[PDB]
Protein backbone atom coordinates (compact mmCIF):
# COMPACT_ATOMS: atom_id res chain seq x y z
CA UNK A 1 0.00 0.00 0.00
CA UNK A 2 3.05 2.22 -0.16
CA UNK A 3 3.32 3.42 -3.76
CA UNK A 4 5.30 1.09 -6.05
CA UNK A 5 8.91 1.51 -7.07
CA UNK A 6 9.30 1.77 -10.82
CA UNK A 7 12.03 -0.38 -12.32
CA UNK A 8 13.04 -1.64 -15.74
CA UNK A 9 15.67 -3.78 -17.35
CA UNK A 10 18.37 -2.17 -19.43
CA UNK A 11 19.30 -4.84 -21.97
CA UNK A 12 17.89 -7.30 -24.48
CA UNK A 13 18.98 -10.74 -25.64
CA UNK A 14 19.36 -11.14 -29.43
CA UNK A 15 16.72 -13.14 -31.29
CA UNK A 16 18.86 -15.77 -32.94
CA UNK A 17 21.07 -17.26 -30.22
CA UNK A 18 23.92 -18.94 -32.14
CA UNK A 19 25.39 -16.95 -35.00
CA UNK A 20 28.85 -16.91 -36.43
CA UNK A 21 28.57 -13.28 -37.50
CA UNK A 22 27.23 -11.71 -34.30
CA UNK A 23 29.09 -14.14 -32.02
CA UNK A 24 32.39 -13.24 -33.69
CA UNK A 25 31.53 -9.54 -33.95
CA UNK A 26 32.35 -9.57 -30.23
CA UNK A 27 36.04 -9.53 -31.15
CA UNK A 28 35.99 -5.76 -30.97
CA UNK A 29 33.45 -5.32 -28.25
CA UNK A 30 34.95 -7.75 -25.72
CA UNK A 31 38.65 -8.07 -26.46
CA UNK A 32 39.35 -4.64 -27.91
CA UNK A 33 37.41 -2.89 -25.14
CA UNK A 34 38.08 -5.30 -22.26
CA UNK A 35 34.53 -6.18 -21.20
CA UNK A 36 33.03 -8.64 -18.71
CA UNK A 37 30.34 -10.35 -20.77
CA UNK A 38 27.81 -9.92 -23.52
CA UNK A 39 25.33 -8.16 -21.22
CA UNK A 40 27.57 -5.09 -21.32
CA UNK A 41 27.24 -5.19 -25.11
CA UNK A 42 23.52 -5.98 -25.09
CA UNK A 43 23.06 -3.00 -22.78
CA UNK A 44 24.52 -0.52 -25.26
CA UNK A 45 22.45 -1.72 -28.21
CA UNK A 46 19.35 -1.48 -26.02
CA UNK A 47 19.87 2.23 -25.36
CA UNK A 48 20.92 2.69 -28.97
CA UNK A 49 17.72 0.99 -30.11
CA UNK A 50 15.85 3.23 -27.67
CA UNK A 51 17.39 6.26 -29.40
CA UNK A 52 16.32 5.31 -32.93
CA UNK A 53 12.72 4.61 -31.93
CA UNK A 54 12.39 8.19 -30.72
CA UNK A 55 14.24 9.55 -33.76
CA UNK A 56 12.12 7.59 -36.25
CA UNK A 57 9.03 8.86 -34.46
CA UNK A 58 10.16 12.46 -34.90
CA UNK A 59 11.15 12.15 -38.57
CA UNK A 60 7.68 10.87 -39.48
CA UNK A 61 6.18 14.06 -38.05
CA UNK A 62 6.16 17.29 -40.04
CA UNK A 63 9.19 19.54 -40.16
CA UNK A 64 8.63 22.58 -37.92
CA UNK A 65 6.41 20.47 -35.71
CA UNK A 66 6.82 22.00 -32.22
CA UNK A 67 7.04 18.46 -30.84
CA UNK A 68 9.71 17.58 -33.42
CA UNK A 69 11.66 20.75 -32.68
CA UNK A 70 11.53 20.45 -28.88
CA UNK A 71 12.40 16.78 -28.43
CA UNK A 72 14.71 16.99 -31.42
CA UNK A 73 17.16 19.48 -29.91
CA UNK A 74 16.83 17.76 -26.54
CA UNK A 75 17.82 14.43 -28.09
CA UNK A 76 20.73 16.05 -29.94
CA UNK A 77 22.12 18.07 -27.04
CA UNK A 78 21.97 15.06 -24.75
CA UNK A 79 23.95 12.99 -27.25
CA UNK A 80 26.27 15.91 -28.01
CA UNK A 81 27.03 16.40 -24.30
CA UNK A 82 28.23 12.82 -23.76
CA UNK A 83 30.30 12.99 -26.94
CA UNK A 84 28.71 10.23 -29.00
CA UNK A 85 27.48 12.64 -31.67
CA UNK A 86 30.30 14.67 -33.17
CA UNK A 87 30.64 18.42 -32.84
CA UNK A 88 28.71 19.24 -36.00
CA UNK A 89 26.77 16.14 -37.00
CA UNK A 90 23.67 17.52 -35.32
CA UNK A 91 20.80 16.17 -37.40
CA UNK A 92 18.21 13.45 -36.84
CA UNK A 93 19.45 11.68 -39.96
CA UNK A 94 22.78 11.18 -38.19
CA UNK A 95 21.60 9.84 -34.84
CA UNK A 96 20.20 6.96 -36.89
CA UNK A 97 23.66 6.38 -38.32
CA UNK A 98 24.99 6.27 -34.76
CA UNK A 99 26.44 2.84 -34.03
CA UNK A 100 27.61 0.86 -31.01
CA UNK A 101 31.28 1.76 -31.42
CA UNK A 102 31.22 5.40 -30.35
CA UNK A 103 29.36 4.60 -27.14
CA UNK A 104 32.07 2.33 -25.77
CA UNK A 105 34.57 5.09 -26.55
CA UNK A 106 32.88 7.42 -24.06
CA UNK A 107 32.98 4.83 -21.27
CA UNK A 108 35.34 5.71 -18.46
CA UNK A 109 36.90 2.26 -18.79
CA UNK A 110 38.29 3.32 -22.18
CA UNK A 111 38.59 7.08 -21.60
CA UNK A 112 41.08 6.24 -18.85
CA UNK A 113 43.03 4.13 -21.35
CA UNK A 114 43.00 6.74 -24.13
CA UNK A 115 44.12 9.48 -21.72
CA UNK A 116 47.41 7.69 -20.99
CA UNK A 117 48.04 6.33 -17.49
CA UNK A 118 46.53 2.90 -18.05
CA UNK A 119 48.86 1.01 -20.49
CA UNK A 120 46.03 -1.47 -21.30
CA UNK A 121 42.28 -1.22 -21.76
CA UNK A 122 41.69 -3.81 -19.03
CA UNK A 123 44.41 -2.55 -16.80
CA UNK A 124 42.19 0.52 -16.64
CA UNK A 125 39.20 -1.60 -15.59
CA UNK A 126 41.17 -2.97 -12.65
CA UNK A 127 42.33 0.51 -11.62
CA UNK A 128 38.83 2.00 -11.72
CA UNK A 129 37.20 -0.59 -9.48
CA UNK A 130 40.16 -0.45 -7.08
CA UNK A 131 39.12 3.15 -6.25
CA UNK A 132 41.97 4.94 -8.00
CA UNK A 133 40.40 7.28 -10.57
CA UNK A 134 38.41 10.36 -9.58
CA UNK A 135 36.46 12.67 -11.87
CA UNK A 136 36.55 16.24 -10.65
CA UNK A 137 36.46 15.70 -6.90
CA UNK A 138 34.55 12.40 -6.85
CA UNK A 139 36.01 8.90 -6.85
CA UNK A 140 34.13 6.65 -9.26
CA UNK A 141 34.60 2.89 -9.49
CA UNK A 142 31.97 2.30 -12.19
CA UNK A 143 33.65 1.35 -15.50
CA UNK A 144 30.55 2.39 -17.49
CA UNK A 145 30.52 5.99 -16.30
CA UNK A 146 30.01 7.50 -19.81
CA UNK A 147 32.02 10.69 -19.33
CA UNK A 148 30.80 14.02 -20.71
CA UNK A 149 32.56 16.56 -22.95
CA UNK A 150 33.57 18.85 -20.12
CA UNK A 151 35.09 16.04 -18.08
CA UNK A 152 38.18 14.68 -19.93
CA UNK A 153 40.40 17.23 -18.21
CA UNK A 154 39.18 15.84 -14.89
CA UNK A 155 40.06 12.15 -15.16
CA UNK A 156 43.05 11.89 -12.83
CA UNK A 157 44.20 9.76 -9.94
CA UNK A 158 42.28 10.15 -6.71
CA UNK A 159 43.60 12.29 -3.83
CA UNK A 160 43.24 9.19 -1.63
CA UNK A 161 44.78 6.70 -4.08
CA UNK A 162 48.46 5.69 -3.74
CA UNK A 163 49.21 6.85 -7.28
CA UNK A 164 47.94 10.34 -6.44
CA UNK A 165 50.19 10.55 -3.41
CA UNK A 166 48.74 9.80 0.02
CA UNK A 167 50.83 7.08 1.73
CA UNK A 168 50.95 3.92 -0.49
CA UNK A 169 48.81 0.92 0.28
CA UNK A 170 49.08 -2.20 2.40
CA UNK A 171 51.33 -4.19 0.08
CA UNK A 172 54.25 -1.78 -0.14
CA UNK A 173 53.55 -0.57 3.41
CA UNK A 174 53.95 -4.09 4.76
CA UNK A 175 56.78 -4.91 2.34
CA UNK A 176 58.81 -1.95 3.57
CA UNK A 177 57.90 -3.10 7.09
CA UNK A 178 59.67 -6.45 6.90
CA UNK A 179 62.88 -4.87 5.58
CA UNK A 180 62.70 -2.49 8.53
CA UNK A 181 62.67 -5.43 10.96
CA UNK A 182 65.33 -7.34 8.98
CA UNK A 183 67.75 -4.62 7.82
CA UNK A 184 66.96 -1.68 10.12
CA UNK A 185 67.25 -3.69 13.33
Amino acid sequence: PRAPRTYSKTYSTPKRPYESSRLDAELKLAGEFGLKNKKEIYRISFQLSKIRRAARDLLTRDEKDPKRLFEGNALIRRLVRVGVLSEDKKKLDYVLALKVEDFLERRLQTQVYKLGLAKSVHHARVLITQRHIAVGKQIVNIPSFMVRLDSEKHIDFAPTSPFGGARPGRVARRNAARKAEASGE
Binding site: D24, L27, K28, E32, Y113, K114, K119, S120, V121
Partner: protein, 111 residues
Protein backbone atom coordinates in the same frame (compact mmCIF):
# COMPACT_ATOMS: atom_id res chain seq x y z
CA UNK B 1 53.63 -13.84 -30.57
CA UNK B 2 52.40 -14.31 -26.99
CA UNK B 3 52.13 -11.00 -25.08
CA UNK B 4 55.66 -9.93 -26.00
CA UNK B 5 54.42 -7.02 -28.11
CA UNK B 6 50.69 -7.55 -28.74
CA UNK B 7 49.91 -5.30 -25.78
CA UNK B 8 52.96 -3.06 -26.21
CA UNK B 9 52.12 -2.47 -29.87
CA UNK B 10 48.52 -1.63 -28.97
CA UNK B 11 49.35 1.84 -27.64
CA UNK B 12 46.16 3.77 -28.55
CA UNK B 13 45.95 2.19 -32.02
CA UNK B 14 43.91 -0.92 -31.13
CA UNK B 15 44.08 -2.47 -34.67
CA UNK B 16 47.17 -4.13 -36.13
CA UNK B 17 46.62 -7.89 -36.41
CA UNK B 18 43.00 -8.36 -35.30
CA UNK B 19 42.09 -10.79 -38.10
CA UNK B 20 40.49 -14.18 -37.36
CA UNK B 21 42.46 -17.44 -37.17
CA UNK B 22 41.89 -20.46 -39.41
CA UNK B 23 38.92 -21.47 -37.32
CA UNK B 24 38.73 -25.12 -36.31
CA UNK B 25 38.90 -24.65 -32.47
CA UNK B 26 39.13 -28.43 -31.84
CA UNK B 27 40.94 -29.81 -34.89
CA UNK B 28 44.68 -29.82 -34.24
CA UNK B 29 47.28 -27.24 -35.16
CA UNK B 30 48.69 -26.13 -38.51
CA UNK B 31 52.34 -27.01 -37.79
CA UNK B 32 52.57 -28.77 -41.18
CA UNK B 33 49.98 -26.62 -42.97
CA UNK B 34 52.85 -24.89 -44.75
CA UNK B 35 54.38 -28.22 -45.83
CA UNK B 36 51.01 -29.40 -47.17
CA UNK B 37 51.21 -26.87 -50.00
CA UNK B 38 54.82 -27.74 -50.84
CA UNK B 39 54.01 -31.43 -51.35
CA UNK B 40 51.01 -30.37 -53.46
CA UNK B 41 52.78 -28.09 -55.95
CA UNK B 42 56.05 -30.04 -56.29
CA UNK B 43 55.48 -32.63 -59.03
CA UNK B 44 57.82 -35.34 -57.75
CA UNK B 45 58.14 -37.54 -54.67
CA UNK B 46 59.40 -36.00 -51.43
CA UNK B 47 60.36 -37.83 -48.27
CA UNK B 48 58.01 -37.16 -45.33
CA UNK B 49 60.23 -36.74 -42.23
CA UNK B 50 61.61 -40.21 -42.67
CA UNK B 51 62.00 -42.02 -39.38
CA UNK B 52 62.57 -41.97 -35.62
CA UNK B 53 66.06 -43.48 -35.29
CA UNK B 54 66.95 -43.14 -31.60
CA UNK B 55 63.92 -41.26 -30.25
CA UNK B 56 62.19 -44.55 -30.94
CA UNK B 57 64.70 -46.98 -29.44
CA UNK B 58 65.81 -45.07 -26.35
CA UNK B 59 62.55 -43.39 -25.35
CA UNK B 60 60.33 -46.47 -25.62
CA UNK B 61 62.25 -48.01 -22.73
CA UNK B 62 62.43 -44.85 -20.61
CA UNK B 63 58.67 -44.38 -20.93
CA UNK B 64 57.15 -47.85 -20.92
CA UNK B 65 59.66 -50.25 -19.32
CA UNK B 66 59.46 -48.03 -16.20
CA UNK B 67 55.90 -48.95 -15.17
CA UNK B 68 53.48 -48.62 -18.04
CA UNK B 69 51.94 -50.34 -21.07
CA UNK B 70 51.19 -48.86 -24.49
CA UNK B 71 47.51 -49.61 -23.96
CA UNK B 72 47.85 -47.50 -20.83
CA UNK B 73 50.20 -44.98 -22.46
CA UNK B 74 47.99 -44.38 -25.49
CA UNK B 75 44.98 -43.93 -23.19
CA UNK B 76 46.47 -40.96 -21.30
CA UNK B 77 47.74 -39.31 -24.49
CA UNK B 78 44.38 -40.09 -26.20
CA UNK B 79 45.54 -41.96 -29.27
CA UNK B 80 44.89 -45.44 -30.61
CA UNK B 81 47.21 -48.15 -29.22
CA UNK B 82 48.68 -48.71 -32.68
CA UNK B 83 49.85 -45.08 -32.90
CA UNK B 84 52.25 -45.62 -29.99
CA UNK B 85 53.04 -49.00 -31.56
CA UNK B 86 54.52 -47.30 -34.63
CA UNK B 87 56.33 -44.78 -32.45
CA UNK B 88 58.14 -47.67 -30.76
CA UNK B 89 60.93 -48.55 -33.19
CA UNK B 90 60.17 -47.20 -36.67
CA UNK B 91 57.43 -46.93 -39.32
CA UNK B 92 55.83 -43.56 -38.55
CA UNK B 93 55.63 -40.02 -39.85
CA UNK B 94 56.10 -38.00 -36.63
CA UNK B 95 53.69 -35.12 -36.15
CA UNK B 96 54.19 -32.49 -33.51
CA UNK B 97 51.04 -32.72 -31.39
CA UNK B 98 51.30 -36.48 -30.85
CA UNK B 99 55.03 -36.28 -30.12
CA UNK B 100 54.43 -33.35 -27.74
CA UNK B 101 51.86 -35.28 -25.70
CA UNK B 102 54.29 -38.21 -25.73
CA UNK B 103 56.90 -35.97 -24.09
CA UNK B 104 54.80 -34.13 -21.49
CA UNK B 105 53.03 -37.26 -20.24
CA UNK B 106 56.24 -39.20 -19.52
CA UNK B 107 58.97 -36.58 -19.12
CA UNK B 108 61.84 -37.76 -21.33
CA UNK B 109 63.20 -34.68 -23.08
CA UNK B 110 63.94 -36.07 -26.57
CA UNK B 111 62.07 -34.41 -29.42
Amino acid sequence: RSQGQINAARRQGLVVSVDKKYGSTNTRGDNEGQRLTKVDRETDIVKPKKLDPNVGRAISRARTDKKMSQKDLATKINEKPTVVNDYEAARAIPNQQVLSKLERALGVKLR
